[PDB]
Amino acid sequence: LVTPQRLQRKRHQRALKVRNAQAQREAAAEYAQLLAKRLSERKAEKAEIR
Amino acid sequence: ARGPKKHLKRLAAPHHWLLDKLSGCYAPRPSAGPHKLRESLPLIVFLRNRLKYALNGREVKAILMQRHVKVDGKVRTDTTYPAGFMDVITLDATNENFRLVYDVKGRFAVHRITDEEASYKLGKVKKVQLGKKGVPYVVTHDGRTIRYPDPNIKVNDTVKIDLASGKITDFIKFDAGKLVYVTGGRNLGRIGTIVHKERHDGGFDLVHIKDSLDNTFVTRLNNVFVIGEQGKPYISLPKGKGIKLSIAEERDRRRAQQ
Amino acid sequence: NGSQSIKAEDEKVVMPYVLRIFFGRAQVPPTSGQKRSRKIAVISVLPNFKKPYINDFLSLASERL
Amino acid sequence: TVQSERAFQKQPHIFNNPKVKTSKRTKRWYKNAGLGFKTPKTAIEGSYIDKKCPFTGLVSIRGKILTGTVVSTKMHRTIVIRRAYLHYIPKYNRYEKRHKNVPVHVSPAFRVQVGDIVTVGQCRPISKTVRFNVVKVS
Amino acid sequence: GISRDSRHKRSATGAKRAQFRKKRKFELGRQPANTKIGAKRIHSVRTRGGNKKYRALRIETGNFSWASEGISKKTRIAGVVYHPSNNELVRTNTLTKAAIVQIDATPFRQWFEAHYGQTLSKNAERKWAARAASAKIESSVESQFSAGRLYACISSRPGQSGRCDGYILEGEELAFYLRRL
RNA sequence: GAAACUGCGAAUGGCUCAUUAAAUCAGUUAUCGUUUAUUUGAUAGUUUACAUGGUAUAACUGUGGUAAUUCUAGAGCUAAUACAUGCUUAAAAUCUCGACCCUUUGGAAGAGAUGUAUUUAUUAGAUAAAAAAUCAAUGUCUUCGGACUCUUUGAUGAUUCAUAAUAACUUUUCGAAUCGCAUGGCCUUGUGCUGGCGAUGGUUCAUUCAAAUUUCUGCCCUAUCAACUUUCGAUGGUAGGAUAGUGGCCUACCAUGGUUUCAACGGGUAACGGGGAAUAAGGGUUCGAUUCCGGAGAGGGAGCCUGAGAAACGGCUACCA
Ligand SMILES: [Mg+2]
Ligand SMILES: [Mg+2]
Ligand SMILES: [Mg+2]
Ligand SMILES: [Mg+2]
Ligand SMILES: [Mg+2]
Ligand SMILES: [Mg+2]
Ligand SMILES: [Mg+2]
Ligand SMILES: [Mg+2]
Ligand SMILES: [Mg+2]
Ligand SMILES: [Mg+2]
Ligand SMILES: [Mg+2]
Ligand SMILES: [Mg+2]
Ligand SMILES: [Mg+2]
Ligand SMILES: [Mg+2]
Ligand SMILES: [Mg+2]
């Protein structure tokens, strides 16, 4: 039977899914920035050694 | 046998639990969990045989079902949940926080901690590997999978994990001069500083550890856990500070304090 | 040149059926991995058909437009 | 002659693209076994195919490393070595000579005669009795 | 009935071992699936753990890969022509890994026509002119294309995965197997 | 809340020492050679919906058979976290096929495809250290001359490793049609939109309890047992089948190998192995079915369903008694 509890459960699942996706994207972006900064620093050090 | 075992005789149980050999015939078998069977302290033994809060297993079940016990900031209800090294046990009603650390004798010791120090734990990085979709992750000694680690973190390093978020706050590289804690073998519970790591390709690495009393001992690398820099531990250490004392000196100290 | 292929004499009657049946399968929402391979198979069989029949299949797609 | 057999001897998943025709020599894949076991140049520049070769095959050297004296080389691509040792009898406080014959897979990159000293490394079960593979000759 | 234990065999020295124990399930074996050309018949097998295996009792189509052009097309299997392990499989037309089979060339030929505009809109002309350099192929493959049946080698295990994938013989592979044929 | 369906357990525990002489077992290794219910931690915008069927039945009603059993036959009903189906959710990038203006250094509306799972083929997964000339394709830039820098890659002693990418394939999976408690927040006042605390499911990875195989060394008496194994696999190579997986485990073709007076092979064993027990001044000698660990069995052989886990026996089937 279609009852507001079922609608609430469906909506809750959809919201959980979207929120998880966004959080994963944010973590990926942060890691990309960290890797880029480390890479730039290492390249600068290599240039200094030359 | 035709399958996994589900019983544990008292005599076969780990020695360091300190179980009476005549109280019964069986001992708590720790369920599967973060820590290995032989290196874990089930909550029943901790609440009953160490803290003496519960008089028997049924009272322990009564405690757990009330949701008063938290392990690592999460409520557990299994009597035989395998709590182990560096796990934080919080009992809010008593306003008590404990960190499970081996004493010098090699047994889990009831160590009371402040709430702030209870906010985090330490984990030995057992593995560093790329997961699906090219996402690096680290597996620690307690089976925690943490994604997006700091790239400099390598195996055998230590990571300070915040329990609320399950993220790495800081990390310690395994290097000479670092403070380490022995978590296996006859030297279990001792604390010292690294002196040198012998490497043997295709074999077990050995690490030389010098104690504060300048005594030295060699231990397999699997049994070493980096806990901080010399004189600056990242956790509060139990009494004795991991110093092994001879039987004669123990007699002298015992007679003196008495 | 298949052994079970439609004979040239019988093509003219059968091919209009063959063109139309495949058209619906191209309209399957190309959404799941099995369903995506289905669409690729439908379009991949076009070269087997003679060019006039290929022209017929293209004509059907544009009829709705 | 390499291709002396009903099925073609090829290194799995090593593809020589005929169209490009960059080099005359067929592409050859090789690896170093580790533990400081130098891969011989014959393996690198050889033409043999062997799936049980430690340097060119799909077998890894892990576990114990042993040394022995070749005693038999009459079979194809394998040998039997002899490990001798002294067992201690405490009652008589004296030793006794004992020996064990170990079968070992030998890659064609090595040329072994009867009597020479070979060091071998453990690997996965190659055959009913073979669990070692030759890694140095001397 | 079929068991993979090493106990019933003789020792290395030649001694006749005694029966240590009754047979165990974790060391079992099952009947072979002599896959053959025909209308598709595949039945599942519940294996150790929750995993599943697919038994190709009958099959007539497989995906074959042209490695040089790096393509893979689905094609009916004409038959088995030569097998290294045993000729009886060749006589019976049984499909197993490494068996040499004949397959129709129509999808591959059509792909080559479309991609290179040669035989064995300006957009098409531009693409064809760009790719014209790689058009040339081996004469042996072209002769089979003219015949309409290409020689292919099965790289999959029909008795395990339920598939009949393979790749077109080429170069030394094709020369050697043609000599053996 | 009886009964029944569904899920889980019944493979733990308990008993005995028949068989078992490099077998078990002890110590010590390995899985880069594989399965793993469960626990723990991660992890899936890519898949009529105000929510689909009997392609269905139990319990139950009612009519019955047999001397008898935890025997059940016909008919009538009705459910799911059973069974079987099936949608709903951002943007961007990239790669193909490309109408059309146009012959350019071309451009280009549009039409497609991308998560996972399986199968296969191919590609990347760099490096001991420094400089140039050209052929082809061809991209950013300026001071139209030539110029073009910081350019991306983890782990192991070691890999075809982790991971990624390209082209296809699948009686082919998965991506919540499940349940409890409670009624907060936005307003265009609609039983409108949004929303909390939990349970149970689910792909893959890791951890844990485990499982399987496995490297080196070690067993009492017997030489009046000296040669054994190989036809019917014994040793090894190749290819395949099977296995969760390595492997003569089995098949087909090949060679003739493998062990042995440093005792193989055969025989006896009132032989389960060990931690241990007794005695002895020490060496030694004997005992260990028996409180713990490991192995095997359920009257004797043989063979299987289920399930993550059984060759189970307080599960089933034959034969022998
Ligand atoms: Mg190792
Ligand atoms: Mg005997
Ligand atoms: Mg042994
Ligand atoms: Mg359970
Ligand atoms: Mg889970
Ligand atoms: Mg009925
Ligand atoms: Mg044979
Ligand atoms: Mg094989
Ligand atoms: Mg007996
Ligand atoms: Mg005895
Ligand atoms: Mg005993
Ligand atoms: Mg049994
Ligand atoms: Mg009896
Ligand atoms: Mg039985
Ligand atoms: Mg029983």
Quickly list DSSP for D31-50: ---STT-PPPHHHHH-----
If asked whether residues B143 and B83 sit together in one domain, one would say no
What is the extent of the structural domain holding D115?
1-138
If asked whether residues E99 and E39 sit together in one domain, one would say yes
Q: Which residues pair with B137 in a beta bridge?
A: B129, B147
Contact D62, D35 (CB under 8 A): no
**Which residues in chain A are followed by a discontinuity, with C-to-N distance exceeding 2.5 angstroms?**
none
Number of structural domains found in chain D: 1
Sign of the CA dihedral with B77 first, then B82, B87, and B89 last: positive
User: Which residues of chain A (1-30) touch nucleic strand F at CB < 7 A?
Assistant: 2, 4-15, 17-18, 20-25
Spacing of C-alpha B154 from chain mean position: 21
Sign of the CA dihedral with E33 first, then E35, E36, and E41 last: positive
If asked whether residues E38 and E91 sit together in one domain, one would say yes
If asked whether residues E127 and E67 sit together in one domain, one would say no
CATH at residue B212: 2.30.30.30
If asked whether residues E82 and E119 sit together in one domain, one would say no
- Establish how many alpha carbons lie within 13 A of residue B101's alpha carbon, considering only the half-sphere containing its beta carbon: 26
Q: What Rg, from alpha-carbon coordinates, does chain E have?
A: 22
Element (H, E) at B115: helix B115-118
For residue D138, give the 3-state DSSP assignment: coil
Distances (CA, A) of E154 to E57, E74, E137, E168: 16, 13, 22, 9
What residues of C are in contact with residue E104 (Cβ under 8 Å)?
A: 1-2
For residue D96, give the 3-state DSSP assignment: strand
CA distance B89 to B53: 14
If asked whether residues E95 and E137 sit together in one domain, one would say no
For residue E13, which of D125, D101, D87, D134 has the smallest C-alpha distance?
A: D101
For residue C28, which of C41, C44, C39, C40 has the smallest C-alpha distance?
A: C39
Q: Which residues pair with B191 in a beta bridge?
A: B181
Q: Match 């004493």 to its residue by tokens.
A: B103
Sign of the CA dihedral with B101 first, then B107, B110, and B111 last: negative
Contacts of B218-222 with C-beta under 8 Å, sequence gap 24+, read: B219/B182, B219/B184, B219/B185, B219/B187, B220/B184, B220/B185, B221/B156, B221/B197, B222/B184
CA distance C39 to C23: 10
Q: Which DSSP symbol is given to B79?
A: T
Distances (CA, A) of E66 to E11, E63, E117, E151, E171: 47, 10, 18, 11, 12
Residue D41 CB closer than 7 angstroms to strand F?
no
For residue E45, give the 3-state DSSP assignment: strand
Element (H, E) at B188: none
Rounded to the nearest angstrom, the distance between the alpha carbon of E43 and the centre of ligand 8 is: 25
Contact B100, B87 (CB under 8 A): yes
Contact E178, D4 (CB under 8 A): no
CATH at residue D119: 2.40.50.1000
CA distance E111 to B158: 57
If asked whether residues E37 and E85 sit together in one domain, one would say yes
Residue E108 CB closer than 7 angstroms to strand F?
no
If asked whether residues E101 and E119 sit together in one domain, one would say no
Tell me which chains share at least 3 CB pairs under 8 Å with chain A: B
For residue D59, which of D2, D4, D128, D11 has the smallest C-alpha distance?
A: D11
The answer to whether residue B250 is domain-embedded is: no
Say what the alpha-carbon torsion angle D34, D35, D36, D41 is, to the nearest 10 degrees.
Answer: -40
Amino acid making up residue E165: D
User: Which residues of chain E (111-150) touch nucleic strand F at CB < 7 A?
Assistant: 115, 121-124, 127
CA distance E46 to E80: 29
For residue B151, which of B163, B168, B164 has the smallest C-alpha distance?
A: B168
Amino acid making up residue E38: G
If asked whether residues E50 and E116 sit together in one domain, one would say no
| Solved using | cryo-EM
Q: Which residues pair with B130 in a beta bridge?
A: B136
Distances (CA, A) of B237 to B49, B98, B103, B109: 22, 12, 9, 11
Contact D45, D98 (CB under 8 A): no
Q: How far is E77 from chain C (nearest CA, A)?
A: 12
For residue B95, which of B77, B78, B76, B70 has the smallest C-alpha distance?
A: B70
If asked whether residues B16 and B102 sit together in one domain, one would say yes
Contacts of C55-61 with C-beta under 8 Å, sequence gap 24+, read: C56/C15, C56/C16, C56/C19, C57/C19, C57/C22, C57/C23, C60/C19, C60/C20, C60/C23, C61/C23
Sign of the CA dihedral with D4 first, then D8, D14, and D15 last: positive
For residue B6, which of B25, B31, B40, B23 has the smallest C-alpha distance?
A: B31
Q: Match 């008795």 to its residue by tokens.
A: E159
For residue B215, which of B191, B196, B239 has the smallest C-alpha distance?
A: B191
Number of structural domains found in chain E: 3
CATH at residue E142: 1.10.168.20
Amino acid making up residue B200: H
Q: How far is C13 from chain E (nearest CA, A)?
A: 23
Number of structural domains found in chain B: 3
Structure tokens that stand for E149 in this block: 């049946």
CATH at residue B135: 2.40.50.740
Query: b/e map of D57-72 (b: 16 or more CB within 10 Å)?
Result: bebebeeebbebebee
User: Which residues of chain E (19-78) touch nucleic strand F at CB < 7 A?
Assistant: 19-30, 32-33, 40-43, 45-51, 53-55, 61, 63, 65, 67, 70-74
Q: Which residues pair with D96 in a beta bridge?
A: D87
Residue B32 CB closer than 7 angstroms to strand F?
yes
* Strand arrangement of the beta sheet that strand B178-182 belongs to: B216-220, B206-210, B191-198, B178-182, B224-229, B232-233
What is the extent of the structural domain holding E40?
31-105+149-181
If asked whether residues E119 and E83 sit together in one domain, one would say no
Query: Least CA distance to B200: which residue of chain D?
Result: D35
For residue E94, give the 3-state DSSP assignment: strand
If asked whether residues E156 and E97 sit together in one domain, one would say yes
For residue E92, give every residue at least 6 positions away whose Cβ sits within 8 Å of its Cβ, in sequence order, or none: E34, E36
Sign of the CA dihedral with E120 first, then E115, E66, and C2 last: negative
For residue E152, which of E91, E85, E63, E88 has the smallest C-alpha distance?
A: E63
Q: Which DSSP symbol is given to B187?
A: T
CA distance B210 to B87: 26
Amino acid making up residue D21: K
CA distance E140 to E57: 33
Q: Match 């090219």 to its residue by tokens.
A: B134
What residues of B are in contact with residue D54 (Cβ under 8 Å)?
A: none
Distances (CA, A) of B202 to B205, C44, D134, E44: 9, 54, 17, 43
If asked whether residues B84 and B167 sit together in one domain, one would say no
Query: Least CA distance to E66: which residue of chain D?
Result: D17
For residue E104, which of E17, E20, E171, E37 has the smallest C-alpha distance?
A: E37
Structure tokens that stand for E126 in this block: 């531009």
Residue B75 CB closer than 7 angstroms to strand F?
no
If asked whether residues B98 and B147 sit together in one domain, one would say no
What residues of E are in contact with residue D15 (Cβ under 8 Å)?
A: 67
CA distance B217 to D16: 56
CATH at residue B4: 3.10.290.10
* Strand arrangement of the beta sheet that strand B167-172 belongs to: B145-147, B136-140, B120-130, B158-162, B167-172
Amino acid making up residue B133: K
Contact E118, E135 (CB under 8 A): yes
Element (H, E) at E177: helix E172-180
